[PDB]
């Protein structure tokens, strides 16, 4: 930046700039650096392939660039590109080492070759190509290289471990520990764990060789293998260390020719195969699985079916999996899972293959249920099958019947009682089927009497399921249970009151906030049900306290501290209470895995804060304080606005980020959005949570413009804009952006002078802003002025806090907000050098692809806007525009555009200066 | 190829006097074709086969029967018809102006469009090319179907 | 057909039946013969891949079946599956020929290997790996093979 970069100093600056990204752990800026201002050589366009899933297209390009013999570094580029992609057998078989049999003399750059060629020879256990290799190493004179000698000592340890000599290989592994403990190891508390991990995988592969060598018999060797398989659980789930450690156990078990070592070796090949086919790298899963056929395992017939399924060919995988299914009409072949899971996989990717009609799949779904009925993954599968087939008929001209939701609910509710680990993403799909046919049985009930018979007993399914399912699992649809109470059904209204009774008996203190806001409205129907839900609560047995009356004492106080507009220090002894705090670190649910308690431990209200605060906006809402059970100052914000809209934004957020934490296109990049528990109290009022350590970027830019002594105005600023015509907007915008230089790239310096925290903070900034940058636009957020882009000092996340207008309401006002989202020249170079063509664009594409893949669930979550605000037609147009924005239809000339296309459209209309000149100086764009 | 080019057009009436074979090279032609648009189901003891696949013809395809060149060329035919839905429907639009104003011609054209795109005629939703091939073959050679139809289209031959 | 085929005579009938399709030019019956009444061995399910667009998935399966050193014909199956898919540079770089630098002695089935290894060396123009190759050919005594000598003469012409 301090260089004038427009000149030609970007030749010598870049050939080491890519070095400072290609081992930093970050890729999406490296791929962004390569495709911007570096487009001269075609080899630069070739090296982008080896990070973007077409790496083997770049491998064999490098192999024939590697047979030019002109430069030594274009050979080690090929070797490092092989080693980064685990082509170990291809490294040791390279002709760059084998002149005829041996290798060349003392090594200026050849040692960097040998460092690879040793290491792959350690990972391919073959005593001859490992033994002549160190025969060629020990002809050298003075091995200066710090890196060669580690893999050398591991190699001679493996050669001694093949010669059945325990103390000798202990000696050489202790030499390897000495070399790592002096030379390779560096300081902690400065570097990450990401760069230390490359050495920790080698240490974990050094310990298990000493742990498997120290064994004189199979009696302890089996125990050693179980201890190492226990050590394969702390390892995590990344492919590189998993494959490395399993490759070293592979290299152990085929140098030691014990028969128990070979029985271990078949297990290691099968685990390498099923490891690699789950990591989308079936190039080596096949050539590891084929070792299990010379051992002839009876489990490789299914593993090759999964490799065929991941390859792409569907019908041959179906043929082999049904071949081993009718092989399970033979003898025992344990009846519990090894038959039922094979038939379940057959049905699941018979569904996915689209190679059958429905009843052919159902006739063996019931066969799965016959052969095993105490295991709910088949019930999950058939619930997903019906709750997919309902849309795949509904895409055509299919209308409301009841049987395809009857069977769906009848298998979902039977599913939930067993393992309850798929409740977050399926039970909202359940109880929207519970209250669609129920309303259709009220709309035009006099044939479509079938759904009237279907709604007669799905209510019976809910009643019969509630008595022997867990209680907490209804909390996930709690606001959807808080809405749709006025359903005009009179048979599911009693059940949706019963579902709040049952949720109030066990675990009251969380939902008592919602149940006290429930007996509060202007329309006197929610309150009328609020007595009924609270008449019968104290009628139930466990009434430990007067916490209902004290709960209303909190509630009416908190809804009367929003009327008192001052332009006071009321009741205080309501705290302490067994009522628990409204912070989002009270009200979530812990992730259901397979006895746990469904909450974080209780951090209740203790001392209500006294000194409040009101903010400097036009419409002025007010901030309170809470002292919790730990004594932390928990902030609380009370607004005189309907935050019932703001809760559904937040439930969209909490069904969005838990999908973001499941996609490997996002968990590799660690996406996420901020979140805070917002609750309604009554209409045109509400409470919401205060994320700590935050700052508005008005406050960031106010203290940096004045630090440069740049003189500007706030009242004289926008009247000049008001007095400009339609033509002067562009020149006014260009003069204002030449006034203020972009300065947000050094506020990240001033927060994190530790540069590793700065780098991780800028990546976290770009990614976390990138997701919500069109999660808001798809919801039509707008109103994104500089007092509402809140950044946290701790790590650099981005949160959006105002969000009063959604569903593109910001276009329905004079000088309308016609940006998709606030992308603004302070924020662009804050994303980095390359700007928007970097982690921002890639994480945007991942976000949009994940929202297109989950259209039905996200639209199903946002359906509750239509019953929060009931009967508008503009809400219908808003939901249709929302559906088209999710699927990716451009709002002008409407037809479906790609994820990269929609990303480029929204970015090149967000940073467009002709747009950024137009909008109102409340949303002041030139900042 | 014509085994479901006729079925997609709803050919029927495929009795043994209308499966003409040439002595020169062994092609197959269909010559009667008076009824199209699945009209053969609108008569008593209706023709409920997709096409005449009949146990003289099965082992005539070879040892492996229908699981061979027949199935693969069927899949290639159905995939090429799905890839060219718009042009083939555009060619067959002229039925609607040869015979002008029927409503059964509209139902016939909609069933024709669903047969081209690959929708199974019971529980209607989109099925794959290998799926539609296996469906039409395992309902053509099904003996419970082949017992039913009239001895004009005599199936046991 | 004249055999009652329901019995177990379909073991000795098939291992030459696939031979009578895999060079006849027809594939869709060969792929139809393999997936019907022949579903015992998994290697039979592997060899269906090399005719149905996933041939390189079967190549590297054959390469690690080809490093078992148990049978000579499971090596020439790998070599013919390479040659049918034009992997000439991968044929001449095979370790089944290069013991260290040279090759093995007089050839019962190894000549079927050399017939491939000459021919790919003709198709990869590289004078050193073509010159030491016919240096190894001319150490032999009596090359009986009708197929070797064509590619040999093309090699010495090159
Ligand atoms: N969750 C939160 N975390 C931190 N600060 C918050 C949060 N919610 C609101 N704020 C603060 O509240 C300010 C504005 O609150 P807001 O909800 O926008 O009320 P408002 O009157 O609508 N403001 P505005 O619409 O811009 O006139 C922001 O600038 C933040 O400082
Ligand atoms: Mg605001
Ligand atoms: Mg506001
Ligand atoms: Mg006729
Ligand atoms: Mg006729």
UniProtKB/Swiss-Prot annotation, chain A:
Region (G-loop): 614-620
Record region (Binding to the RPA complex): 699-927
Domain PI3K/PI4K catalytic, residue spans: 608-911
Domain FAT residues, every copy: 1-521
Subunit architecture: Interacts with LCD1, which is required for localization MEC1 to the RPA complex. Interacts directly with the RPA subunits RFA1 and RFA2.
Gene name linked to the record: MEC1
UniProt region (Activation loop), positions on chain: 800-824
Protein name as it appears in the record: Serine/threonine-protein kinase MEC1
Outcome of mutating residue 279 to S: In MEC1-100; impairs both the G1/S and intra-S damage checkpoints but not the G2/M damage checkpoint
Domain of life: Eukaryota
FATC domain: residues covered: 895-927
Protein's cellular compartments: Nucleus
Protein function: Serine/threonine protein kinase which activates checkpoint signaling upon genotoxic stresses such as ionizing radiation (IR), ultraviolet light (UV), or DNA replication stalling, thereby acting as a DNA damage sensor. Recognizes the substrate consensus sequence [ST]-Q. Recruited in complex with protein LCD1 by the single-strand-binding protein complex RPA to DNA lesions in order to initiate the DNA repair by homologous recombination, after the MRX-complex and TEL1 are displaced. Phosphorylates LCD1 and RPA2, a subunit of RPA, involved in DNA replication, repair and recombination.
Annotated family: Belongs to the PI3/PI4-kinase family. ATM subfamily.
Catalytic loop, as annotated region: 780-788
Known outcome of mutating residue 788 to K: Impairs kinase activity
């Amino acid at each position: 930046r301090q260089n004038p970069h427009d000149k030609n100093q970007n030749g010598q600056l870049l050939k080491n700039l890519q070095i400072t990204y290609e081992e930093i752990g970050d890729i999406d800026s490296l791929d962004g650096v390569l495709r911007t201002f570096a487009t001269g050589n075609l080899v630069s366009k070739i090296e982008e392939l080896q990070y973007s899933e077409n790496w083997k297209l770049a491998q064999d390009c490098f192999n024939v660039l590697g047979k030019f013999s002109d430069d030594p570094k274009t050979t080690t580029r090929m070797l490092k590109s092989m080693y980064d992609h685990q082509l170990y057998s291809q490294i040791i078989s390279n002709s760059s080492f084998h002149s005829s049999d041996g290798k060349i003399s003392l090594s200026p750059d050849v040692k960097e070759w040998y460092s690879i060629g040793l290491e792959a020879a350690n990972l391919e256990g073959n005593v001859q190509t490992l033994k002549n290799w160190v025969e060629q190493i020990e002809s050298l004179r003075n091995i200066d290289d710090r890196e060669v000698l580690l893999q050398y000592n591991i190699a001679k340890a493996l050669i001694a471990i093949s010669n059945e000599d325990p103390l000798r290989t202990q000696k050489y592994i202790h030499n390897s520990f000495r070399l790592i403990g002096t030379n390779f190891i560096t300081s902690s508390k400065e570097t990450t764990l990401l760069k230390k991990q490359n050495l920790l995988m080698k240490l974990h592969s050094l310990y298990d060789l000493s742990f498997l060598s120290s064994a004189k018999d199979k009696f302890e060797y089996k125990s050693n293998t179980t201890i190492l398989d226990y050590r394969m659980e702390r390892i995590g789930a990344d492919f590189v260390p998993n494959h490395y450690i399993l490759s070293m156990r592979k290299s152990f078990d085929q140098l030691k020719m014990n028969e128990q070592a070979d029985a271990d070796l078949g297990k290691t090949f099968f685990t390498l195969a099923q490891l690699a086919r789950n990591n989308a790298r079936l190039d080596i899963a096949s050539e590891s699985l084929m070792h299990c056929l010379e051992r002839r395992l009876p489990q490789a017939e299914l593993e090759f079916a999964e490799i065929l399924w991941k390859q792409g060919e569907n019908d041959r995988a179906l043929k082999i999996v049904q071949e081993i299914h009718e092989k399970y009409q033979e003898n025992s072949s344990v009846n519990a899972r090894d038959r039922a899971a094979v038939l379940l996989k057959f049905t699941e990717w018979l569904d996915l293959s689209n190679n059958s009609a429905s009843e052919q799949i159902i006739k063996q779904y019931q066969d799965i249920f016959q052969i095993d009925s105490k295991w709910d993954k088949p019930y999950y599968s058939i619930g997903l099958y019906y709750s997919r087939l309902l849309e795949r008929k509904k895409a055509e001209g299919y209308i409301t019947n009841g049987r395809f939701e009857y069977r769906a609910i009848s298998y979902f509710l039977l599913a939930f009682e067993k393992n309850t680990a798929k409740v977050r993403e399926n039970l909202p799909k359940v109880i929207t089927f519970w209250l669609d046919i129920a309303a259709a049985s009220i709309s035009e009930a006099p044939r479509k009497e079938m759904l009237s018979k279907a709604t007669e007993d799905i209510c019976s399914h809910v009643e019969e399921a509630l008595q022997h399912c867990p209680t907490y699992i209804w909390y996930f649809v709690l606001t959807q249970l808080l809405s749709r109470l006025l359903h005009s059904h009179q048979s599911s209204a009693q059940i949706i009151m019963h579902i709040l009774l049952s949720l109030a008996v066990e675990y009251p203190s969380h939902i008592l906030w919602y149940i006290t806001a429930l007996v509060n409205s202007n329309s006197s129907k929610r309150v009328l049900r609020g007595k009924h839900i609270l008449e019968k609560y104290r009628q139930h047995s466990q009434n430990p306290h007067d916490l209902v009356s004290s709960a209303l004492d909190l509630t009416k106080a908190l809804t009367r501290v929003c009327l008192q507009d001052v332009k006071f220090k009321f009741d205080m002894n309501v705290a302490p209470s067994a009522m628990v705090v409204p912070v989002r670190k009270n009200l979530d649910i812990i992730s259901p895995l397979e006895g746990y308690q469904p909450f974080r431990p209780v951090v209740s209200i203790i001392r209500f804060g006294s000194s409040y605060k009101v903010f400097s906006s036009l419409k002025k809402p007010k901030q309170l304080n809470i002292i919790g059970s730990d004594g932390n100052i928990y902030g609380i914000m009370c607004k005189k606005e309907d935050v019932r809209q703001d809760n559904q934004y937040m439930q969209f957020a909490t069904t969005m980020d838990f999908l973001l934490s499941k996609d490997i296109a996002s968990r590799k990049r660690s996406l996420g959005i901020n979140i805070y528990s917002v609750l309604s109290l009554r209409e045109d009022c509400g409470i919401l949570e205060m994320v700590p350590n935050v700052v508005t970027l008005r406050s960031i830019l106010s203290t940096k413009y004045e630090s440069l002594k740049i003189k500007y105005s706030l009242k004289s600023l926008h009247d000049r804009w008001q007095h400009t015509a339609v033509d002067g907007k562009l020149e006014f915008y260009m003069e204002q952006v030449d006034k203020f230089p972009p300065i947000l790239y050094q506020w990240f310096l001033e927060n994190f002078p530790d540069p590793i925290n700065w780098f991780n903070a800028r990546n976290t900034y770009a990614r976390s802003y990138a997701v919500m940058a069109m999660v808001g636009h798809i919801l039509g957020l707008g109103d994104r002025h500089c007092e509402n882009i809140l950044l946290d000092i701790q790590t650099g996340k981005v949160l959006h806090v105002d969000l009063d207008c959604l569903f593109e309401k910001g276009k329905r006002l004079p000088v309308p907000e016609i940006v998709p989202f606030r992308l603004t020249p302070n924020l662009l170079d804050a994303l980095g050098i390359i700007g928007t063509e970097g982690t921002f664009k890639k994480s945007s594409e991942v976000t949009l692809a994940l929202m297109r893949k989950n259209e039905v669930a996200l639209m199903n979550v946002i359906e509750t806007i239509m019953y929060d605000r009931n009967m508008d037609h503009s809400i219908q147009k808003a939901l249709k525009v929302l559906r088209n924005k999710i699927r990716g239809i451009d709002p002008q000339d409407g037809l479906v555009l790609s994820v990269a296309g929609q990303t480029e459209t929204l970015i090149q209309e967000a940073t467009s200066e002709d747009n950024l000149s137009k909008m109102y100086i409340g949303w002041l764009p030139f900042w």
